[PDB]
Design a protein around this nucleic acid. Structure first.
Ligand SMILES: [Zn+2]
Length: 235
DNA sequence: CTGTTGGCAAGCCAGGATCTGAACAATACCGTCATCGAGCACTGCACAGA
């Protein structure tokens, strides 16, 4: 596994089925959580990479940090402590998680290494991500309400995954050219790029349902939603 | 063998209205996680004794 020499090396183990039930939610201090209020009670759910694993090369920790900071998400208890001990000190994460289909691991995202522009870049990135999601969720819902079947009800999931992968290609050049005087220019260029990408991904996600006349109002509403949110992103 | 030149080519005025443009029914399903032990199959294994 590691390639190092070792006196003792294990080669197998034994396991057996074993079940129980933990009622309630144990206050684990190492994970951020989502706060939801159902009925009058407060519900918490620990964060997990569900249908996407938000990540960019070099700055994945910043992407995850901002999602917790902005999108009912709450920071981990160990992070909450550090903020209270040093409120003015800059805070970066060491983070990781898996995307899974039951026993199968589909995706791994980990940032393990031991600035405001980067925050701005990530903030901009997430904005276009959100614009795309709202547009395609609008399509997916309309697709569902129109009694249509198939993968049309989750096109917002695939397109979100494709968003991060297609935009990751832009990141190295962006990071390489960032400095005091060039920051506003490279971020503006990033916006145009991400604007174009969102349009492409929208069209790509929706392409298999061309010539479905009953879906034209759903498609039209979805694209109008996209451009509404894209316009709100240009400063 | 030898075949030409000048001068000249128009203007007026006029192009429409009525009224009409559809409806129904139908858009799929499967598989591409895993676990455990059991109940029940190919499948060769020599043989012992036929
Ligand atoms: Zn090792």
């Amino acid at each position: 596994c590691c390639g190092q020499e070792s006196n003792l090396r294990y080669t197998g183990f034994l396991k057996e089925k074993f079940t129980f039930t933990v009622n309630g939610l144990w206050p684990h201090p190492h994970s951020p959580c989502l706060v939801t209020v159902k009925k009058g009670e407060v519900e918490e759910k620990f964060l997990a990479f569900t249908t996407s694993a938000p990540s960019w090369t070099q700055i994945s920790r910043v992407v995850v940090d901002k999602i917790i900071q902005n999108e009912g998400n709450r920071v981990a208890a160990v992070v909450n402590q550090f903020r209270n001990i040093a409120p003015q000190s800059p805070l970066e994460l060491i983070m990781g998680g898996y995307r899974n289909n039951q026993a199968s691991i589909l995706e791994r995202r980990h940032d393990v290494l031991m600035g405001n522009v980067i925050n701005e870049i990530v903030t901009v990135g997430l904005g276009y991500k959100t614009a795309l999601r709202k547009a395609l969720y609008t399509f997916a819902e309309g697709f569902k309400n129109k009694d249509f079947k198939g993968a049309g009800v989750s096109v917002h999931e695939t397109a979100e995954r494709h968003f991060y992968r297609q935009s990751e290609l832009l990141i190295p050049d962006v990071l390489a050219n960032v400095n005091f005087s060039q920051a506003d220019e490279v971020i503006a260029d990033l916006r145009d790029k991400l604007h174009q990408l969102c349009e492409m991904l929208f069209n790509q996600s929706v392409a298999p349902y061309a010539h479905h006349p009953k879906l034209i109002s759903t498609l039209a509403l979805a694209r109008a939603t996209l451009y509404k949110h894209l316009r709100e992103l240009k400063p």
